[PDB]
């Protein structure tokens, strides 16, 4: 049910790296849908985002099978969770235009 301690802090890593993850619908029982990013199937991935959807953090956008995500400045104010784990280092998504 619960991920290990590496699995959590690394999927918080990549979602803070890239801003957007991908998932799919299929919930673990006939088939084992992982990602090409993370090496755990789907109930871990859905358990991650059920808290992240509840507080209002990372916005969900769906397309016909595969999940997508989205981030807002309301997310980044309320991403004080993982802005805590390094110091003030914002990735090359929000930061600038050239």
């Amino acid at each position: 049910m619960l991920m290990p301690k590496k699995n959590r802090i690394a999927i918080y890593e990549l979602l803070f790296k890239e801003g957007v993850m991908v998932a799919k619908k299929d919930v673990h029982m006939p088939k084992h849908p992982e990602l090409a990013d993370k090496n755990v199937p789907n109930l871990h991935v859905m358990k991650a985002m059920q808290s992240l959807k509840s507080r209002g953090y990372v916005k969900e956008q769906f397309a016909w099978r595969h999940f997508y995500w989205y981030l807002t400045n309301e997310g980044i104010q309320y991403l004080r969770d993982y802005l805590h784990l390094p110091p003030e280092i914002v990735p090359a998504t929000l930061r600038r235009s050239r």
Partner: protein, 51 residues
């Protein structure tokens, strides 16, 4: 645990819809996995014409 027995490695359990995730109607192998319930709705997007 026991979350998965019964292979489904062929047969009905494999063939899925790409649009709504269902397998009642038959599903084809065309570069395209559709029901026909939602194939016809979404052929006007992908370019199939009736002539």
């Amino acid at each position: 645990q026991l979350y998965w027995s019964h292979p489904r490695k062929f047969g009905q359990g494999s063939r899925s819809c790409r649009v709504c995730s269902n397998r009642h109607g038959l599903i084809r192998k065309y570069g395209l996995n559709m029901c026909r319930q939602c194939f016809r709705q979404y052929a006007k997007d992908i370019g199939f014409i009736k002539l």
